[PDB]
């Protein structure tokens, strides 16, 4: 469960993990560089949630890697995806293909409990 | 809960997070190559579950990176493990070594909610 | 839930994903090189959980990547982070800064099922 907005994220079926995004625009990225690729995709999650932005196979076969993809709860922004060319040659992203996904996972990081001793 | 197939995946024990997967014959990475590490296993997942192949500590001290393992619920295939070598020497992978794990999750990429003007 | 010790991880907000893992003392991280830097930060998860050490979304701007931070359940040493400078200029880490941040999730990498050959 989610909310979403924004005109890069498709509809994704229902066996599928994630959400795909779209690149706003043409973009070249040589091997080694590091571009900031920019959505105008906003999500709400609930409690305890959070996104993760990762990649694709179709484009990690071609050295397109995703870095930093971890959207709080509390980002309330557009998404931006860091994405860098471990690639042997350049990538050639051209407007309207699918890039990167967006999947929601819960997390359990919050009540802490004393710790146990006895352990092991 | 998962359903698997494959000679390249390793009973786990209880308290690891993933299932252990074993390089299928003798390969070599130079440094700043990828590969696609081919395996024979299959998996079928529950609904809202997916497959998550990533790296193992003692591979990732050495430079190899996986990138784009998120295996849906909707693929029937066989794993492929796509391999890059972010290390400063060569990586040699021998036949049935540990190279990669594969960690089953739930997502919650579904339910779409309407958006809340109010938050923040 | 979880239990933790240790002076290099901060008290997280709830509506952040993760908790920051700050950094020892000074340290240099050139363009292509890997350090593996230490912590004092040790964790204790319930049954079928597991940590996750990922990245910052500042410090994957700059190019540092962090590689194998899947701490397993059975884990009970002190968390090291594998950290490799994709970027084009170095990296350089002042003591206390936070680099990385520690996710806790639930896995569903237990009960095997049959396999189902009327699927698809």
Same mark, same amino acid.
């Given at each position: 469960?989610?909310?979403?907005?924004?005109?890069?994220?498709?509809?994704?079926?229902?066996?599928?993990? @994630?959400?795909?995004?779209?690149?706003? =625009?043409?973009?070249? !990225?040589? %091997?080694?560089? /590091?571009? &900031?690729?920019?959505?105008?995709?906003?999500?709400?999650?609930?409690?305890?949630?959070?996104?993760?932005?990762?990649?694709?196979?179709?484009?990690?076969?071609?050295?397109?890697?995703?870095? @930093?993809?971890?959207?709080?709860?509390? =980002?309330?922004?557009? !998404?931006? %995806?860091?994405? /860098?060319? &471990?690639?042997?040659?350049?990538?050639?992203?051209?407007?309207?293909?699918?890039?990167?996904?967006?999947?929601?996972?819960?997390?359990?990081?919050?009540?802490?409990?004393?710790?146990?001793?006895?352990?092991?």
């Amino acid at each position: 469960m989610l909310a979403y907005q924004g005109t890069q994220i498709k509809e994704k079926r229902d066996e599928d993990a @994630g959400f795909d995004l779209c690149v706003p =625009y043409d973009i070249m !990225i040589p %091997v080694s560089d /590091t571009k &900031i690729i920019p959505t105008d995709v906003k999500i709400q999650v609930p409690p305890n949630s959070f996104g993760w932005v990762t990649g694709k196979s179709s484009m990690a076969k071609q050295g397109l890697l995703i870095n @930093g993809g971890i959207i709080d709860e509390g =980002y309330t922004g557009e !998404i931006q %995806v860091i994405c /860098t060319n &471990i690639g042997k040659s350049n990538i050639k992203l051209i407007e309207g293909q699918k890039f990167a996904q967006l999947i929601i996972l819960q997390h359990h990081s919050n009540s802490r409990q004393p710790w146990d001793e006895n352990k092991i």
